[PDB]
Design an enzyme around this catalytic site. Structure first.
Site, PDB file in Angstrom:
ATOM      1  N   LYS A   1      -4.286   0.282 -25.356  1.00 44.41           N
ATOM      2  CA  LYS A   1      -4.971  -0.122 -26.569  1.00 44.41           C
ATOM      3  C   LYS A   1      -4.055  -0.424 -27.739  1.00 44.41           C
ATOM      4  O   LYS A   1      -4.183  -1.462 -28.375  1.00 44.41           O
ATOM      5  CB  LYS A   1      -6.070   0.880 -26.907  1.00 44.41           C
ATOM      6  CG  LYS A   1      -7.103   0.874 -25.832  1.00 44.41           C
ATOM      7  CD  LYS A   1      -8.299   1.695 -26.202  1.00 44.41           C
ATOM      8  CE  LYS A   1      -9.434   1.411 -25.214  1.00 44.41           C
ATOM      9  NZ  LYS A   1     -10.670   2.154 -25.527  1.00 44.41           N
TER      10      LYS A   1
ATOM     11  N   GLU B   1      -0.208   4.604  -0.581  1.00 45.49           N
ATOM     12  CA  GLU B   1      -1.172   5.661  -0.799  1.00 45.49           C
ATOM     13  C   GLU B   1      -0.773   6.971  -1.459  1.00 45.49           C
ATOM     14  O   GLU B   1      -1.210   7.206  -2.593  1.00 45.49           O
ATOM     15  CB  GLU B   1      -1.953   5.929   0.473  1.00 45.49           C
ATOM     16  CG  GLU B   1      -3.446   5.739   0.263  1.00 45.49           C
ATOM     17  CD  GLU B   1      -4.105   4.915   1.356  1.00 45.49           C
ATOM     18  OE1 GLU B   1      -3.394   4.502   2.297  1.00 45.49           O
ATOM     19  OE2 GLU B   1      -5.337   4.663   1.280  1.00 45.49           O
TER      20      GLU B   1
ATOM     21  N   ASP C   1      -7.490  12.923 -25.600  1.00 47.55           N
ATOM     22  CA  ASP C   1      -7.652  11.577 -25.035  1.00 47.55           C
ATOM     23  C   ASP C   1      -7.215  10.699 -26.203  1.00 47.55           C
ATOM     24  O   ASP C   1      -8.003  10.339 -27.089  1.00 47.55           O
ATOM     25  CB  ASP C   1      -9.099  11.312 -24.688  1.00 47.55           C
ATOM     26  CG  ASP C   1      -9.325   9.909 -24.311  1.00 47.55           C
ATOM     27  OD1 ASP C   1      -8.307   9.193 -24.271  1.00 47.55           O
ATOM     28  OD2 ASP C   1     -10.503   9.536 -24.064  1.00 47.55           O
TER      29      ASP C   1
ATOM     30  N   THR D   1      -5.004   5.384 -22.189  1.00 42.90           N
ATOM     31  CA  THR D   1      -5.051   4.074 -21.605  1.00 42.90           C
ATOM     32  C   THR D   1      -3.635   3.674 -21.851  1.00 42.90           C
ATOM     33  O   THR D   1      -2.972   4.283 -22.710  1.00 42.90           O
ATOM     34  CB  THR D   1      -5.910   3.122 -22.436  1.00 42.90           C
ATOM     35  OG1 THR D   1      -5.592   3.298 -23.835  1.00 42.90           O
ATOM     36  CG2 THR D   1      -7.380   3.365 -22.174  1.00 42.90           C
TER      37      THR D   1
ATOM     38  N   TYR E   1       0.924  -1.144   0.000  1.00 37.11           N
ATOM     39  CA  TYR E   1       0.000   0.000   0.000  1.00 37.11           C
ATOM     40  C   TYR E   1       0.956   1.184   0.000  1.00 37.11           C
ATOM     41  O   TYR E   1       1.780   1.307   0.889  1.00 37.11           O
ATOM     42  CB  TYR E   1      -0.863   0.068   1.289  1.00 37.11           C
ATOM     43  CG  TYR E   1      -2.377   0.046   1.118  1.00 37.11           C
ATOM     44  CD1 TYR E   1      -3.054   1.111   0.552  1.00 37.11           C
ATOM     45  CD2 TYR E   1      -3.122  -1.087   1.468  1.00 37.11           C
ATOM     46  CE1 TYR E   1      -4.447   1.054   0.323  1.00 37.11           C
ATOM     47  CE2 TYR E   1      -4.509  -1.157   1.244  1.00 37.11           C
ATOM     48  CZ  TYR E   1      -5.156  -0.085   0.668  1.00 37.11           C
ATOM     49  OH  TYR E   1      -6.491  -0.187   0.375  1.00 37.11           O
TER      50      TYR E   1
ATOM     51  N   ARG F   1      -3.996  -3.133 -18.381  1.00 38.04           N
ATOM     52  CA  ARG F   1      -4.983  -2.113 -18.168  1.00 38.04           C
ATOM     53  C   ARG F   1      -4.670  -1.142 -17.034  1.00 38.04           C
ATOM     54  O   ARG F   1      -4.534  -1.506 -15.856  1.00 38.04           O
ATOM     55  CB  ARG F   1      -6.322  -2.797 -18.028  1.00 38.04           C
ATOM     56  CG  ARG F   1      -6.741  -3.406 -19.329  1.00 38.04           C
ATOM     57  CD  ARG F   1      -7.734  -4.517 -19.124  1.00 38.04           C
ATOM     58  NE  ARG F   1      -8.079  -5.143 -20.395  1.00 38.04           N
ATOM     59  CZ  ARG F   1      -8.898  -4.609 -21.287  1.00 38.04           C
ATOM     60  NH1 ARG F   1      -9.484  -3.436 -21.064  1.00 38.04           N
ATOM     61  NH2 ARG F   1      -9.116  -5.250 -22.410  1.00 38.04           N
TER      62      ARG F   1
END
Ligand SMILES: *Cc1c(COP(=O)(O)O)cnc(C)c1O
Ligand SMILES: *Cc1c(COP(=O)(O)O)cnc(C)c1O
Lengths: 464, 466
Positions: free
Chosen positions: A243, A61, A214, A240, A59, A249
């Protein structure tokens, strides 16, 4: 004792048989089908190994400078490495650009940009869903706000011309004067052409709005240098990492940092970092960030650059091959990895075709074409070359493909005659399932595609 | 042929040397340190293999019933399997409960619920951050709306009694009558005790609000039957699939379905609103590999081995409490009903800020937290300690007694540097003195060399060399 608890060492194939077969099955369904879905691709063994590591277990954060926890000497090494590879791979002076690598997928990243720059109810202009935009670029109906982007911000679509397939920019620039957006989105999910980021920047500046690109679909092509870079005109760019970049992902947000004007600096960094955290997300997925870092290395290599040059050419092949068979390509051509095939010239629609081609182990999807009036009976087919190019297919193989697609369209039409002229779809689908006459051709056409597919390789870990 | 570019088959250790080492280093930093951070844990090789699969490669936008794409026979087999395991593992009649399994993580799962049930600007109430609540439960101050929850929705907090460290339910009931929340949140990030879900339901209903439990921290304990189930009173329950459930990072949203109340008779509508908020509302394509891991982790969670590890976890906590109480430390509610304790370092003359750093340098991980009574979130007086991660490596009561002892040594040490630092001294100072002084660095190295020796005696779950 009952301290058999070291079932934690036990491997999947022995721990979860049900899930093992599902993986073995899917990974096989991949090897024998032809993936022509533009947003699909195959991640490398390398990127894929990083996802299974112990980095899942940490973790971390906050951010590399400021974290909320402690054993983070390595997760900081990693996240920084990833930020550096990102800015490098797109050739960006870090004295001009920054990058957040924490978004979980495309969508969150987009959203986080709205939260940060546009605020609750600020206005957004995105290209309409039917004309080629994404769900996250806003999406309404006269009745409901579907996409969160239209639920929390007030959105308005700008459309493409219905005879060229081209974004009508004179329109956008006219309505933007009336709608007064705080952000214009420049990115598409189904558009064969390069966007004029130059003109969009004009329109944005004339309104004091931010120009956001985008580039999810063309991110890969942009690293190679194949299509023009959006980074030259936009203040922010999301994408992303999977793609055409071919990673796992995840998402990234690139923002400008430095000077801005007369007698004043950008503030994009702190607002956007804050929105991602603690604003919207929880603990970053470190194994995901690992794979993204891996994929960015591979993307700088000249082998990626050649695969990306191959991708575009494979598309010109597929276009021509289909044009030559009588199919109309929507803008007449394409500047990148995809094409919008108009099936009205063959007398059918993308709804029906999609299903027949699916049953033949050929994947693609229906899309509305510029002129369509009914998102219920879409006339197009969105075809993209990235995934098949990753398995090796060079032009000549795509001519092979254009031919299979053709057969399939011929097939869908046989079923459209043999179905009646006022035929619902539930029917068409029914007849394709029950009628033995048809099943014969379909089965034949499939047995023929899977064997052709099995020739090339399927990237991934041990077999899958 | 540059088409020998099949660098796609090439393994990580060969393809990315830089990232390989980073992984080899961290996985080692994990074997030698003592993880006492309550939200941390170690996932099994099994759950961990599923993450690397080809499931990564599939886009399955919609839901099992209606998807937007095609090659999904298996992704549907999978998603359904996961939904079934989930309802099963918590023993829920599927005619009374449904489960959405696509949230990318705890945070987005909560956000989706608020987006579906509370709407924009709708009122929400959750436990205050410093009182042990979570960021996503709303978090704002005098100047800024910090958490996205308190930006898009309108939130107001409820707090714990500062003399008892217990949620003051009386005030929450009073305040709810004036604030009119559309949803009340029942879940904590740092709270030693069981929440009275019963009374919270009585406050929610009195206001016509939804009672939502965010059981992220205690989800594992709830599957085993250790702590009481929230499912008996809440309309929705969200959770991470990774804190004490020990899976990979992902989230799920559980919701009620069936008949809610009669005049005829009105049903719950929870499902379609929730599902729609997740998609196409907020998210894009589901992460199938993640869902695979969750499905794996849920099967392991039903097994009696998990039930024993979860029973061990609680007992290890009682051990760690006592061992520390016996050394003079004040545990905040005086004890704990689960996997964590909030240690009050005011009784030892220091604070959570300084301690955290010294213990960190000694390869002992935990974190600072405000204590009920604190006034200054820059001078937190506490330490949040949790047992799950170390219990996953085998440690039993007795091992935790030596742990308690190491932590103690570290507090004694933090105090030595605090005294040798001056009283009016700053955290930048304290931290720098901890770094430059060789006097101190000696003890620190000695204590560290000692913790690692101890940690290495225990296994570390995870796939091979990575
Ligand atoms: C950690 C936590 C979360 C958030 O999950 P992330 O995976 O970090 O987004 C939500 N709720 C509670 C109660 C938590 O402790
Ligand atoms: C696919 C896509 C996304 C969203 O990515 P997800 O992981 O599916 O959320 C965002 N933007 C564009 C333009 C896309 O095509």
């Amino acid at each position: 004792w009952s301290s058999h608890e070291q079932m934690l060492a036990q491997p999947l194939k022995d721990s979860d048989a049900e899930v093992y077969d599902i993986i073995k099955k899917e990974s096989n369904r991949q090897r024998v089908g032809l993936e022509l879905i533009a947003s699909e691709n195959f991640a490398s063994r390398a990127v894929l190994e990083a996802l299974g590591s112990c980095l899942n277990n940490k973790y971390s954060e906050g951010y590399p400078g400021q974290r909320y926890y402690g054993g983070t000497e390595h997760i900081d090494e990693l996240e920084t490495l990833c930020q550096k590879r990102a800015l490098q791979a797109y050739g960006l002076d870090p004295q001009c650009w920054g990058v957040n690598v924490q978004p979980y997928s495309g969508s969150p990243a987009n959203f986080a940009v709205y939260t940060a720059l546009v605020e609750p109810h600020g206005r957004i202009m995105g290209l309409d869903l039917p004309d080629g935009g994404h769900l996250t670029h806003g999406f309404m109906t006269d009745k409901k706000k579907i996409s969160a982007t239209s639920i929390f911000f007030e959105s308005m679509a700008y459309k493409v011309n219905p005879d060229t397939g081209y974004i009508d920019y004179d329109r956008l620039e006219e309505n933007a004067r009336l709608f007064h957006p705080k952000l214009i989105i420049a990115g598409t999910s189904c558009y064969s052409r390069n966007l004029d980021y130059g003109r969009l920047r004009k329109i944005a500046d004339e309104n004091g709005a931010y120009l956001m690109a985008d580039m999810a679909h063309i991110s890969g092509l942009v690293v190679a240098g194949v299509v023009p870079s959006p980074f030259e005109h936009c203040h922010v760019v999301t994408t992303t990492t999977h793609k055409t970049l071919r990673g796992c992902r995840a998402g990234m947000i690139f923002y400008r940092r430095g000077v801005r004007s007369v007698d004043i600096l950008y503030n994009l960094e702190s607002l956007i970092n804050s929105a991602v955290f603690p604003g919207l997300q929880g603990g970053p997925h470190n194994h995901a960030i690992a794979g993204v870092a891996v994929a960015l290395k591979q993307a700088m290599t000249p082998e990626f650059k050649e695969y990306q040059r191959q991708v575009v050419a494979n598309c010109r092949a597929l276009s021509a091959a289909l044009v030559e068979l009588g199919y109309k390509i929507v803008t007449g051509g394409s500047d990148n990895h995809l094409i919008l095939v108009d099936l009205r010239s063959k007398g059918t629609d993308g709804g029906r075709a999609e299903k027949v081609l699916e049953a033949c182990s050929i994947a693609c999807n229906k899309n509305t074409c510029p002129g369509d009036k009914s998102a219920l009976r879409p006339s197009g087919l969105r075809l993209g070359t990235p995934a098949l190019t990753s398995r090796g297919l060079l032009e000549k193989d795509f001519q092979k493909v254009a031919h299979f697609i053709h057969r399939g369209i011929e097939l869908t039409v046989q079923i459209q005659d043999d179905t009646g002229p006022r035929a619902t779809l539930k029917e068409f689908k029914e007849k394709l399932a029950g009628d033995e006459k048809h099943q014969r051709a379909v089965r034949a056409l499939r047995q023929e595609v899977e064997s052709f597919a099995a020739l090339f390789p399927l990237p991934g870990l041990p077999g899958f």
